[PDB]
Design a protein around this ligand. Structure first.
Ligand SMILES: Nc1nc2c(ncn2[C@@H]2O[C@H](COP(=O)(O)OP(=O)(O)OP(=O)(O)O)[C@@H](O)[C@H]2O)c(=O)[nH]1
Ligand SMILES: [Mg+2]
Lengths: 1013, 174
């Protein structure tokens, strides 16, 4: 229990206290807090000790529990994995005989086979590790032996099946990053070479054994071989027929068999047409037995035990795999039509199961079928393939309409200041599900417009008569009705839309309650939102719609206001040109009417809703071609925010202290949000508005920044969580979003530079510098980043002043550890990357010592374990190397000063197991640098090995570096690896793999030998 | 309403968000820093459900190799598992079969959820149409965000349903 008591296990001069090892191991699985951590610490040190394996016998002989014993095994596995090649041959043979020994015994004990099967598993793994290290050369009779023992004894056979699965796995499935390419190849070839003997044993057991557990293991092992074995074994034996007749229809073998049949089904080859046909035919015949075609599979799944649910999943996998790969095979054969329709039947039934994962699998098939029929022909209301499917295509259309997923996904999210904002998710699983469903329904709609409309007409009628009425149902149908927008001809769709709208309006009438009207109107809004093309042709409808949306912005029933705003932005972008030209029958363009009435339209909206409203109008204003007109639109557009703004500025000149008033500050934040959304929609032209507020906005930013700093000086970051502080950070952040938002969208760089950049220095940059560390706004670094990427040349002259404000004081926050100020690390490197990409001369203008601080910080970035930081750092370094090379003048003194130094730092991160996500970039950087030397660097990398040519000097230096850091590496390993950095400098994938081989070798000890080939 | 407790093992490459996810469930805070978990930290998570309380002992394991500790040894006696990856890093999804391998070789028949974390981020690198590993391994898959609160409770809900044996279990507040 006391640390110094548990450390007793590490003495190695005393005999092992088995009782103590049991307590520690017990503390590991059952202890809490600090005592469990101590166990974890002691047991890790013990497992890693060079001499721990000596006591493994003791552990397995005297340990009372299986936990301890399993731990014993962990120690033995580590020794084989790390130091098998430096153990004396005599200890190896002893370990072999001890492990097969222990395997024979435990898998011969029936209690053991029942209860301690995890332990058995681990022993099997031990053996496999031995095989991975020396199987073919130092154990040539292994396979014959395993086969012979297997035919000698049933208990050996059962376990030996597990060993072979594990071996197959390790060699064919998990070899990358664990074993070198040459050894990996050797292992595969050696397994290919002896497979027939193994296959024969599996065939023998399958054809003759009456041992259920043994048969099951055999099938689990076959399932792993199917991944790699030559096709001959799969398709030119009786394997398929055996699986189907013998196993598929036996409950306890049903899942393994089907999974095997699925792997066979996925093979795509022209050679085995007949056997694919038989696989389908025969499988269908068995499925008709175990799962009659009139089963309710939805209920079966709902009610089924675990392996019934599995079974139905595997069935959708088998049918989906088989038909995606081989449907034409069944299509061409007339006497198989009924079996093909039966397979479609099953897919439809399995399609009813209420589990997303299964539905997705079925959907993958429906999507394939629809795609194929539409590739065959895309015309409506007859070509040959479509002909076969026409009896049931209505059922797929019906399935799509009935189960259509939600098309957009809105969430409530807290930001860094404690506001809950309404966001929409992008590219999620459930959104991708929607898109696949749309595509399926859209393809099937093109094949028959009438059928789709028929189905929709009917679902709608059953809303109206209350038969199928619910919020959920009506939603589904409306989602569906929206999904097929664009699939009909314009004439058909006009007629279609009109019917749909009339019928839903009728149902709005019929249904009473605010709740119901909100649901129905939301659906109507959604649908018309999805049909801009109709809105564009019928101005009178578009005007009614927009006005109706303006009415809805005053209904505070939950959801109505969001829907009106959401629909209004959809329509504003899709139809913007309609708001700015004078429509037929109209006095002014609609935008004028809208702008003159903003004050009444938004009077009841929530602030977030206001922001979305302004964005929508932004797009309309954006679409006005004439510049002088657009300016007057913007002036008027911004009028209400400008009033509150001006008023608050006036009070602020009067007394800086209202800038501490909760309400004033909320309001500034809300006004700035509006400016950001308006700029997002309007783009460059918003310059007129940005300019009006610029200097006042920077001055409030500066006061608030000082207030925040002072508050943190006085009462720390606890004061930071406070509400008022939060809403002041809002203002700073929106100020920065607004500057960066406009700049990004500007297209007059000379202007931005002379006009907007200069005032940032005293208000933002020097303000950041003077801010207390915990008060410095990380978004400052991101805004500069965005600014530098947009201006490039235009801002190169100002880098010196920017970095004097931010480069050093930031570095100092992030250079004590790798963890603190995460957003500062991320944004600071993005700024550096901007300067290095777009203003490279600024780096040349600075003195060597200053440039040294810059490289040091680049190097510091790619040593991060925050992958984003490290990846940007690696890209910066790559971009810098390429830049340096542009001018022969500085290039060669850069090489002379820094080349070798950079190499060492790259090597320290390539050879660390924590940085493997950087491999591609490590490879690119290393390959480029090695290639640079092997083609010519004028100045000697070593100042006085005047003789050694850079290439010879590099080979000796890098080799020496590596021998130094990894002393257990053999000379031939280092040489072969260094040579490869030159050979493979043209092939980054091969260079990449060369590094990965190296990482394998540095984690093990070899002795006076090598994997040659 | 008796107190059932389950050993839940949480595995995945480093930086995926294993620790951030547990901390948000434990305290409601979102940790922005990446502080690698050394070895394993076990954190009790109590959910209240419409059929009484359920406690998961989350064994939050280390994803970097250098900090692995006892690795697969932590998995002994686990009753369920979550495998995490980061949808902004292809390497993490590629290494998911490796986490799955080590896990089932120690606990063969346990409910396992696979989660793709960080779906809040705009530049998604592991596309939803790519994530298929769980199908043949009979796993649940949920797209999740420790930061946006997207599908935040879904992994525990599924495991709880599968462990209690009640498909209709729901989580309740207090
Ligand atoms: N954007 C975003 N970032 C996230 C999310 N979840 C976590 N992160 C961030 O990603 C990092 C994940 O860190 P950890 O949770 O410590 O990493 P881990 O997976 O536990 O890693 P190890 O303990 O090293 O195995 C942290 O910086 C988090 O702030 C998420 O949903 N979205
Ligand atoms: Mg962690």
């Amino acid at each position: 229990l006391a640390d110094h008591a548990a450390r007793q296990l590490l003495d190695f001069s005393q005999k092992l206290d088995i009782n103590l090892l049991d307590n520690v191991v017990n503390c590991l699985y059952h202890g809490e807090g600090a005592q469990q951590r101590m166990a974890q610490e002691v047991l890790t040190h013990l497992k890693e000790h060079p001499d721990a394996w000596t006591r493994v016998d003791t552990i397995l002989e005297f340990s009372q529990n299986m936990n301890t014993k399993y731990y014993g095994l962990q120690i033995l596995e580590n020794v084989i994995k790390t130091r098998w090649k430096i153990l004396p041959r005599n200890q190896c043979e002893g370990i072999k005989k001890y492990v097969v020994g222990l395997i024979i015994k435990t898998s011969s004990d029936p209690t053991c086979v029942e209860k301690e099967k995890v332990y058995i598993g681990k022993l099997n793994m031990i053996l496999v590790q031995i095989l991975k290290q020396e199987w073919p050369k130092h154990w040539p009779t292994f396979i014959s032996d395993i086969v012979g023992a297997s035919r000698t004894s049933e208990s050996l056979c059962q376990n030996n099946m597990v060993i072979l699965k594990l071996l197959s796995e390790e060699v064919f499935d998990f070899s990358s990053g664990q074993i070198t390419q040459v050894k990996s190849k050797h292992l595969k070839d050696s397994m290919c070479n002896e497979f027939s003997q193994i296959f024969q044993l599996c065939q023998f057991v399958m054809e003759n054994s009456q041992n259920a557990p043994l048969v099951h293991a055999t099938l689990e092992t076959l399932l792993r071989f199917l991944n790699w074995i030559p096709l001959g074994y799969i398709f030119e034996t009786k394997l398929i027929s055996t699986l189907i007749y013998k196993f598929l229809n036996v409950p306890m073998f049903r899942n393994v068999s089907l999974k095997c049949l699925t792997e066979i089904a996925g093979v795509s080859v022209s050679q085995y047409e007949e056997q694919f046909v038989t696989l389908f035919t025969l499988t269908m015949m068995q499925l008709k037995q175990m799962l009659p075609l009139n089963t309710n599979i939805r209920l079966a799944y709902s009610n089924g035990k675990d392996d019934e649910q599995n079974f139905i999943q595997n069935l959708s996998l088998f049918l989906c795999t088989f038909l995606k790969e081989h449907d034409q095979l069944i299509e061409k054969r007339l006497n198989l039509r009924e079996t093909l329709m039966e397979a479609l039947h099953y897919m439809l039934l399995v399609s009813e199961v209420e589990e997303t994962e299964i539905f997705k699998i079925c959907l993958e098939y429906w999507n394939h079928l629809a795609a194929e029929l539409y590739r065959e022909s895309p015309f409506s209301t007859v070509p040959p393939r479509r002909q076969l499917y026409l009896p049931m295509l209505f059922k797929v259309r019906l399935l799509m309409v009935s189960r259509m997923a939600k098309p957009e996904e809105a969430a409530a999210v807290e930001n860094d200041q404690g506001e809950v904002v309404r966001e929409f998710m992008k590219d999620t699983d459930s959104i991708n599900l929607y898109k696949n469903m749309r595509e399926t329904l859209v393809y099937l709609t093109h094949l028959d417009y009438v059928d789709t409309e028929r189905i929709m007409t009917e679902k709608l009628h059953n809303q109206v008569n209350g038969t199928e009425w619910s919020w959920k149902n009506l939603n589904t149908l409306c989602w569906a009705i929206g999904s097929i927008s664009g699939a009909m001809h314009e004439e058909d769709e006009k007629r279609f839309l009109v019917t749909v709208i009339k019928d839903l309006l009728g149902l709005c009438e019929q249904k009473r309650g605010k709740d119901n009207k909100a649901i129905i109107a939301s659906n109507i809004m959604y649908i018309v939102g999805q049909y801009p093309r109709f809105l564009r042709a019928h101005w009178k409808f578009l005007k009614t719609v927009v006005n109706k949306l303006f009415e809805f912005m005053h209904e505070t029933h939950d959801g109505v206001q969001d829907m009106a705003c959401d629909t209004f932005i959809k329509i504003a972008q899709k139809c913007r040109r309609h708001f700015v030209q004078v429509q037929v029958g109209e006095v002014m363009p609609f935008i004028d009417e809208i702008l003159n009435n903003i004050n009444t339209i938004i009077c009841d909206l929530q602030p977030q809703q206001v922001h979305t409203f302004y964005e929508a109008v932004g797009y309309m204003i954006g679409a006005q071609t004439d510049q002088t007109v657009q300016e007057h639109l913007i002036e008027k557009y911004m009028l209400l925010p400008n009033q509150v703004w001006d008023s608050i500025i006036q009070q602020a000149t009067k007394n800086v202290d209202i800038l501490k008033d909760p309400e004033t500050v909320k309001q500034l934040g809300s006004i700035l949000k509006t400016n950001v959304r308006a700029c997002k929609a309007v783009g460059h032209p918003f310059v007129i508005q940005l300019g009006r507020i610029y200097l006042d906005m920077l001055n409030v930013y500066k006061c608030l920044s000082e207030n925040i700093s002072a508050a943190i000086q006085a009462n720390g970051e606890m004061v930071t969580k406070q509400p008022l502080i939060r809403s002041m950070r809002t203002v700073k952040r929106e100020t920065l979003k607004l500057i960066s938002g406009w700049v990004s969208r500007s297209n007059d760089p000379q202007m931005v530079a002379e006009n907007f950049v200069p005032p940032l220095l005293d208000a933002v940059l020097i303000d950041y510098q003077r801010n207390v560390p915990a008060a410095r706004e990380p978004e400052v670094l991101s805004t500069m980043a965005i600014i530098v990427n947009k201006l490039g040349g235009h801002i190169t002259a100002e880098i010196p002043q920017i970095f004097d404000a931010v480069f050093e004081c930031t570095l100092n926050m992030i250079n004590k550890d790798f963890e603190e100020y995460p957003e500062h690390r991320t944004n600071f490197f993005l700024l550096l990357q901007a300067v290095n990409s777009h203003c490279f001369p600024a780096f040349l203008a600075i003195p060597p010592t200053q440039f040294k601080l810059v490289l040091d910080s680049i190097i510091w970035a790619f040593k991060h374990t925050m992958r984003n930081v490290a990846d940007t750092g690696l890209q910066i370094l790559f971009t810098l190397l390429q830049n340096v090379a542009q001018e022969e003048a500085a290039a060669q003194s850069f090489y002379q000063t820094y080349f070798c130094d950079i190499l060492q730092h790259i090597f320290s991160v390539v050879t660390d197991t924590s940085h493997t996500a950087g491999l591609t970039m490590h490879a690119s950087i290393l390959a480029y640098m090695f290639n640079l030397v092997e083609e010519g660097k004028i100045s000697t990398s070593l100042n006085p090995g005047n003789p050694v040519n850079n290439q010879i000097f590099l080979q000796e230096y890098v080799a020496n570096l590596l021998k130094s850091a990894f002393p257990h590496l053999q000379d031939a390993q280092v040489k072969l690896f260094v040579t490869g950095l030159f050979s493979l400098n043209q092939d980054i994938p091969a260079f990449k793999e060369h590094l990965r081989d190296f990482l394998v070798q540095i984690k093990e000890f070899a002795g006076e030998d090598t994997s040659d080939l | 309403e008796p107190q059932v407790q389950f050993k839940l093992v949480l595995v995945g490459d480093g930086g995926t968000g294993k620790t951030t996810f547990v901390k948000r469930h434990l305290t409601g805070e979102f940790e922005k820093k990446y502080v690698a978990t050394l070895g394993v930290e076990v954190h009790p998570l109590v959910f209240h459900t419409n059929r009484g309380p359920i406690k998961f002992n989350v064994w939050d394991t280390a994803g970097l190799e250098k900090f692995g500790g006892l690795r697969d040894g932590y998995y002994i006696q686990a009753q369920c598992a979550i495998i995490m990856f980061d949808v902004t890093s292809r390497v993490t999804y590629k290494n998911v079969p490796n986490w799955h391998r080590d896990l089932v070789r120690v606990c063969e028949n346990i409910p396992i959820v696979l989660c793709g974390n960080k779906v809040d981020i705009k530049d998604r690198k592991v596309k939803a149409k790519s994530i298929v590993f769980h199908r043949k391994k009979n796993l649940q898959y949920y797209d999740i965000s420790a930061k946006s609160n997207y599908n935040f409770e879904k992994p525990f809900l599924w495991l709880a349903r599968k462990l209690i044996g009640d498909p209709n279990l729901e989580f309740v507040a207090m």
